[PDB]
Design an enzyme around this catalytic site. Structure first.
Site, PDB file in Angstrom:
ATOM      1  N   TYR A  56       0.409  -0.951   0.219  1.00  0.00           N
ATOM      2  CA  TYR A  56       0.113   0.130   0.261  1.00  0.00           C
ATOM      3  C   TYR A  56       0.914   1.314  -0.018  1.00  0.00           C
ATOM      4  O   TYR A  56       0.305   2.210  -0.727  1.00  0.00           O
ATOM      5  CB  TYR A  56      -1.285   0.443   1.438  1.00  0.00           C
ATOM      6  CG  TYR A  56      -1.960   0.823   0.830  1.00  0.00           C
ATOM      7  CD1 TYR A  56      -3.067   0.598   0.506  1.00  0.00           C
ATOM      8  CD2 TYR A  56      -1.733   2.326   1.673  1.00  0.00           C
ATOM      9  CE1 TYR A  56      -3.412   2.133   0.283  1.00  0.00           C
ATOM     10  CE2 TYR A  56      -2.395   3.063   1.956  1.00  0.00           C
ATOM     11  CZ  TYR A  56      -3.779   3.252   0.811  1.00  0.00           C
ATOM     12  OH  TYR A  56      -4.614   4.036   1.184  1.00  0.00           O
ATOM     13  N   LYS A  62       2.128   4.492  -1.874  1.00  0.00           N
ATOM     14  CA  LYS A  62       1.695   5.856  -2.709  1.00  0.00           C
ATOM     15  C   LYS A  62       2.661   6.637  -2.866  1.00  0.00           C
ATOM     16  O   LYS A  62       3.074   7.411  -3.795  1.00  0.00           O
ATOM     17  CB  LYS A  62       0.967   6.174  -1.159  1.00  0.00           C
ATOM     18  CG  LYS A  62      -0.461   4.821  -0.976  1.00  0.00           C
ATOM     19  CD  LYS A  62      -1.542   5.628  -2.283  1.00  0.00           C
ATOM     20  CE  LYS A  62      -2.590   4.700  -2.610  1.00  0.00           C
ATOM     21  NZ  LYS A  62      -3.668   5.296  -3.256  1.00  0.00           N
TER      22      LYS A  62
END
Length: 209
Positions: free
Chosen positions: A136, A140
């Site tokens: 995750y 990003k």
């Protein structure tokens, strides 16, 4: 520079520029409130959604229905906008997460830049770090860096924590509506430079109602 409660005056200034905006991820939780607020505040002359399906509902909004696996076929969708908001996010599993949050976002940002988008706004996430062992936070981090390399005239990256529908609380969570208010308040305000990075704390301050 740092104006106080002259924000309504800056919204009016912004309106008089007659700008157009596109939004990715308008069906998502932040996207939909962004859309609501963009229309309510009547900040832009044209609003365009770019997504994979026509969203039904507010009745003067272009929708570009695109195929993200063939996004070059749809490059025109990204042409002529002054401002862009990417609120795309994914549920989907690991490969699907990367496909959407990394590849579709980046491809979209490449095409925004090639379509003369001047101010790109990226909804990232607290903790983004391309070197993360969390997939995750990794994606990003990686998208932020790549989007920064496109060298938009102005890039605004937002790293909210937990999205609600230094102190612990300053970093942890923020109401979606507060994230949207932060984005649009930032939008009408002078740039802090080619890249602007707003962490949860800063989003809480700027998005206060």
């Amino acid at each position: 520079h740092h104006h106080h409660h002259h924000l309504p005056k800056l919204r009016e200034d912004f309106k008089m520029q007659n700008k157009s905006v596109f939004i990715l991820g308008a069906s998502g939780e932040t996207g939909k409130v962004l859309l609501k607020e963009i229309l309510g505040q009547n900040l832009f002359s044209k609003v365009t959604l770019i997504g994979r399906r026509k969203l039904t509902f507010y009745k003067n909004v272009n929708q570009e229905v695109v195929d993200f696996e063939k996004l070059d076929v749809y490059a025109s969708a990204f042409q002529g906008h002054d401002v862009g908001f990417c609120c795309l996010g994914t549920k989907a599993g690991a490969e699907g997460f990367v496909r959407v949050d990394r590849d579709y976002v980046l491809k979209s940002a490449e095409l925004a830049k090639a379509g003369g988008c001047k101010h790109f706004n990226l909804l990232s996430s607290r903790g983004a770090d391309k070197s993360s062992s969390f997939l995750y936070l990794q994606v990003k981090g990686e998208v932020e860096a790549k989007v920064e390399e496109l060298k938009f005239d102005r890039l605004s990256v937002f790293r909210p924590g937990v999205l609600l529908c230094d102190s612990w609380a300053s970093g942890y969570a923020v109401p979606v509506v507060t994230v949207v208010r932060a984005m649009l308040n930032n939008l009408v305000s002078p740039s802090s430079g080619q890249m602007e990075l707003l962490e949860n704390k800063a989003i809480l301050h700027l998005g206060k109602d």
